[PDB]
Amino acid sequence: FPSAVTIKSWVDKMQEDLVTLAKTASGVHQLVDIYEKYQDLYTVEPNNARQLVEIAARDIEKLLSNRSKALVRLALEAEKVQAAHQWREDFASNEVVYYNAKDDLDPEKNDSEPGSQRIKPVFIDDANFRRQVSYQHAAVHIPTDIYEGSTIVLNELNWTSALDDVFKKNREEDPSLLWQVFGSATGLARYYPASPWVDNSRTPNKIDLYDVRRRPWYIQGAASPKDMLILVDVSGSVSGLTLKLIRTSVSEMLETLSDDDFVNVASFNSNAQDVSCFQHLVQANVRNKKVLKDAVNNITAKGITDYKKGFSFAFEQLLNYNVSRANCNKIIMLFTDGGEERAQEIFAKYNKDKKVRVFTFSVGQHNYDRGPIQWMACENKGYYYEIPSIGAIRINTQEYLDVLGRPMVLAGDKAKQVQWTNVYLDALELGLVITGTLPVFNITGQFENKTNLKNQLILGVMGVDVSLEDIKRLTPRFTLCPNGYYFAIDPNGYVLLHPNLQPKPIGVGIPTINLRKRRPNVQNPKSQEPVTLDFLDAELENDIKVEIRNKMIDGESGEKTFRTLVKSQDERYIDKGNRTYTWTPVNGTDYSLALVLPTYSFYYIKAKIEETITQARYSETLKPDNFEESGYTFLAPRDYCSDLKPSDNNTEFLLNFNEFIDRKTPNNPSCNTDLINRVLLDAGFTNELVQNYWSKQKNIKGVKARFVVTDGGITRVYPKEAGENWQENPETYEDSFYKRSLDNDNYVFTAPYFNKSGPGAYESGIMVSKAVEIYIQGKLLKPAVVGIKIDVNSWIENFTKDCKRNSDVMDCVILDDGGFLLMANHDDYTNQIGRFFGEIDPSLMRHLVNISVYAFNKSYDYQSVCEPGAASKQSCITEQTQYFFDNDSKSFSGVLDCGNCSRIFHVEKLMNTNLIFIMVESKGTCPCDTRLLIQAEQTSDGPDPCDMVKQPRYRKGPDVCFDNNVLEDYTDC
């Protein structure tokens, strides 16, 4: 075996050759010099991490206050208009004129429904609405199973019409408003502007299941956070249809709970016990609700009924106070059929003060006595419901919120506070939005106090949508580093704004489907859950990030600098870099805003170009006519002006940009001059580099293509023949190699992908990049990243010319930090370049991760596409693994044994590069193989959710809530 001195000499020669190749081909020092040669076309401006967050927080607060102003107007006008409603009964004389959505657009429909007159809108297209909308009137959505033309419905359409004027006034005051909707307690929904419903009734094979009463914003604004305990009867007599209906009803009731509510499901048959592994109230987020649903769809009916034991168990669980709780609305929901014992002594013993509401449900068709459960219902300030079939479940499992809102109504003007929901997906296909809610009270005879009977219920909820794109426009990122970003958090740990939050729904568990019980024409529901992603689930969890998150949850402002592990844009690498977190609270709301800025990013380049001819020359520079001369150019689709729009097509976007800058003057009366000036300056600098340096040596032996990517959005690949091989995002802020090069302080090798269609193995080459570092006045700046694509074959010749071609004695390979193969020694691994080393040599890879030359760690991705198994595409959790170097040590030596074998290895690390050199005896020396070490997205279901509830994350629930009012009547059941 060759000794250490020989291998040090060999790897030193290889690293020197590669470093010289990259340095003298890319031209890092040339770009550095031309950046430092001018120092007059731009100025270096600080990025104050404190002022920026204050400015952004104030802008967000002002936007949300603006949105809340349009809510109080709607609420007051609706209350005033409804107070003076007449309630007629004969509508066939004076029809009701309204535009019913989810109706056909044919003028020849000839509806002629008695009591209603239709409207045919014009439906111009619109922006900020990726639909066609009409601003003249408001649309009305009525659920499919609710008949329009009822006396109840026709009266709502009669008085709610008065809201269109307020809708239009709200729009004309602020033209950036999204949907404004009134959700009625009768199932109606009147929203503005008018737009056809996404899913009409039965023109296709599909139907819609949209009741406004079950939407997250309505449920949030209709009552306060709950402490629910579902008590299920699993005695013998519920066997049959009533057990199946009980299971479905419990699932539907769970569907109405949010993250501020705490729930647990228990069952009783001569003995009370929990249905799952929780044993107390839990947060009722997506995962815990999924666990409860799974446990509920497993209960069987056997035994003798005993209400006293069940109610004792439920009350004791409601009296815990050892755990996190909403601590507002302690309620018990009993799912039974009928009995004979009312258990007066239990209610006297446990809630003689009536601090707990008891809602009772009679499920199924049966002959058992229902009097006792009605008495249980409307003795303890509750209500009584009957669920005889499946069609009754949806409407009966949601009406308990009418009772819970009575104290909120009796509170008066104290309860008219604006609340903002979690991030969810808009029902009209607008993206991720949040809604601000405000309840509307019924005040008839308020000045005379006549009835006050139906005045204890709310009329409905007003809502205003704010898209996450609206908030992101107030946190600009193009003066920051590609590694810098904003993110905002709830007083629940959930991210309002984060780079890793995606429009996909949050996945839970593993998606299991049965294709053999799937009728083709049934229109099954898709999803209704909100996109709640915790802050610790959006980045890598750390012991300091938890402290920072806890500190910014409870309304505190501070700053922090620490070392952290940064996952790359594509989940294949992990980098260690300094980051600074600056956070402040948003005053008006409960959100908290933080700005993540690395070092080397406290100063940015602000262009000071003022010569029109130079601007014109820089502009004509990035013209497609001379892509042969100055290199193929890409442009980042940023919002330079409101007229030209990005279009996911870089050639025609560049054409539009060129004609836009050349046709009208770059004075830009309504466009962003800073972005345009930066783009022009960077284009000029990159072209100067290309013409002066890259063009001199048109052909280089080992170099396939040379690229430069700069801040501003200019990318240049010198050989036009290499342009169509460039598969990187035109936006420089989304290029993984760019950010990796920014973090590291040396040359970075990016292994090509494997099993991907297109030229990526030999016709593209290996990519090496380095970040350009300039010094203007002793301040760090990393504006651009240069690099080259090196020939695979030329590198092979460099390598072979012991370590000999197709050697049957020794294996010599090169890996990057991440275990991806970049250079083999036998031409069988070489063909499968770009694979994880554990896919081809699992034993050595496992030993390497064991000797602590490779460090690895795992994370969960809660927004992934998953293929359903047997037990199109669905959403689930995938576990991601990334490998990275651990110590600074360079040389490691040892022997690994697998079944009385002996393979000697000696890994060596290349200086000033993220590569590593490994030599080992051939796999044919010892035919041993335990199992492959997979590095890929693996479909998963963890973590275990009923071990997190024992030590849950820090949380801060709402502090103001309304329950237990003396004036409440509670004589209804």
Partner 1 sequence: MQLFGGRYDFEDTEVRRSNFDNFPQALISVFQVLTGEDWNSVMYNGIM
Ligand X SMILES: *[C@@H]1O[C@H](CO)[C@@H](O[C@@H]2O[C@H](CO)[C@@H](O[C@@H]3O[C@H](CO)[C@@H](O)[C@H](O)[C@H]3NC(C)=O)[C@H](O)[C@H]2NC(C)=O)[C@H](O)[C@H]1NC(C)=O
Ligand Y SMILES: *[C@@H]1O[C@H](CO)[C@@H](O[C@@H]2O[C@H](CO)[C@@H](O)[C@H](O)[C@H]2NC(C)=O)[C@H](O)[C@H]1NC(C)=O
Ligand Z SMILES: *[C@@H]1O[C@H](CO)[C@@H](O)[C@H](O)[C@H]1NC(C)=O
Ligand U SMILES: *[C@@H]1O[C@H](CO)[C@@H](O[C@@H]2O[C@H](CO)[C@@H](O[C@@H]3O[C@H](CO)[C@@H](O)[C@H](O)[C@@H]3O)[C@H](O)[C@H]2NC(C)=O)[C@H](O)[C@H]1NC(C)=O
Residues annotated within a binding site for a divalent metal cation: 233, 235, 237
Tokens of 89: 């009964």
20 binds, among ligand Y, ligand X, Ca ion, none (CB under 5 to 8 A by kind): ligand X
Q: 703: closest CA among 632, 769, 791, 766? A: 791
Omega within 30 of 0 (cis) for the link into 927 = no
- Given phi > 0 = left and psi -120 to 50 = alpha, else beta, which region is 27? left
Binding mask 340-369 for partner 1 (x = CB under 8 A): -------------------------x-x--
Residue 913 DSSP one-character state: B
Which is nearer to Ca ion, 337 or 575 (by Cβ)?
A: 337
Residue 844, classed as helix, strand or coil, is helix
Residue 857 makes contact with ligand Y by CB under 6 A: yes
Which is nearer to ligand X, 17 or 662 (by Cβ)?
A: 17
Helices (H), 807-957: 842-850, 945-948
Residue 304 makes contact with partner 1 by CB under 8 A: no
Q: Which of residues 598-637 bind ligand X (CB under 6 A)?
A: none
CA distances to 734, 764, 767, 792, 805 from 831, rounded to whole Å, are 29, 14, 17, 11, 14
219 touches 285 (CB < 8 A): no
Rounded distance between C-alpha atoms, residue 226 and residue 228, angstroms: 6
Which residues contact ligand U (rule: CB under 6 A)? Answer: 81, 87, 94, 158-159, 161-162, 442, 444-445, 451, 453-455, 459
Residue 702 makes contact with ligand X by CB under 6 A: yes
Q: 887: closest CA among 909, 912, 870? A: 909
Residue 235 makes contact with Ca ion by CB under 5 A: yes
Residue 617 makes contact with ligand Y by CB under 6 A: no
66 binds, among ligand Z, ligand X, Ca ion, none (CB under 5 to 8 A by kind): ligand Z
Percent helix, percent strand, percent coil in the chain, to nearest 5: 30, 25, 45
Q: Which of residues 530-559 bind ligand Y (CB under 6 A)?
A: 541
Residue 616 makes contact with ligand Y by CB under 6 A: no
DSSP E strands, 586-717: 592-598, 603-607, 632-635, 703-710, 714-717
Which is nearer to ligand Y, 357 or 545 (by Cβ)?
A: 545
525 binds, among ligand Y, Ca ion, ligand Z, none (CB under 5 to 8 A by kind): none
305 binds, among ligand Y, ligand X, Ca ion, none (CB under 5 to 8 A by kind): Ca ion
What's the alpha-carbon Rg for the chain, to the nearest Å? Answer: 33
Place of tokens 């193989």: 929
Rounded distance between C-alpha atoms, residue 480 and residue 901, angstroms: 55
39, 117, 176, 239: which one binds partner 1 (CB under 8 A): 239
908 sits in which H/E element? strand 903-909
**Range 758-762 contact pairs with CB under 8 angstroms and sequence separation of 24 or more:** 758/727, 759/725, 760/727, 760/834, 761/792, 761/831, 761/833, 761/834, 762/792, 762/793
Task: Provide the edge-to-edge strand list for the sheet that holds 558-567.
Answer: 495-497, 485-489, 592-598, 574-585, 558-567
Q: Kindly state the smallest distance separating residue 557's Cβ from ligand Y, in Å.
A: 7
Place of tokens 């909308």: 133
Residue 30 makes contact with ligand X by CB under 6 A: no
Q: Kindly state the smallest distance separating residue 221's Cβ from ligand Y, in Å.
A: 25
297 touches 247 (CB < 8 A): yes
73, 244, 354, 955: which one binds partner 1 (CB under 8 A): 244
- Within 13 A of 822's CA, how many CA atoms are on the CB side? 25
Binding mask 795-834 for ligand X (x = CB under 6 A): ---x------------------------------------
Binding residues: 233, 235, 237
367 binds, among partner 1, ligand Y, ligand U, none (CB under 5 to 8 A by kind): partner 1
Q: 376: closest CA among 358, 354, 349, 351? A: 358
Which is nearer to ligand Y, 180 or 882 (by Cβ)?
A: 882
Residue 239 makes contact with ligand X by CB under 6 A: no
390 binds, among partner 1, ligand Y, ligand U, none (CB under 5 to 8 A by kind): partner 1
116, 184, 237, 630: which one binds Ca ion (CB under 5 A): 237
Q: Which of residues 573-612 bind ligand Y (CB under 6 A)?
A: 587
Which residues contact ligand Z (rule: CB under 6 A)? Answer: 59, 62-63, 66, 294-295, 298, 577-578, 745, 755, 832, 850-852, 887-889, 892, 899-900
857 bridge partner residues: 882
- Residue closest to ligand X when measured from CB atoms: 702
889 binds, among partner 1, ligand Z, Ca ion, none (CB under 5 to 8 A by kind): ligand Z
Tokens of 877: 């959790």
112, 322, 757, 971: which one binds ligand Y (CB under 6 A): 322
Rounded distance between C-alpha atoms, residue 680 and residue 823, angstroms: 40
Which is nearer to ligand U, 148 or 490 (by Cβ)?
A: 148
Which is nearer to ligand X, 439 or 702 (by Cβ)?
A: 702
Residue 268, classed as helix, strand or coil, is strand
Which is nearer to partner 1, 247 or 678 (by Cβ)?
A: 247
Interface residues toward partner 1, by CB under 8 A = 239-241, 243-244, 301, 365, 367, 389-390
Interface residues toward Ca ion, by CB under 5 A = 235, 237, 305
Interface residues toward ligand X, by CB under 6 A = 17, 20-21, 24-25, 700-702, 794, 798
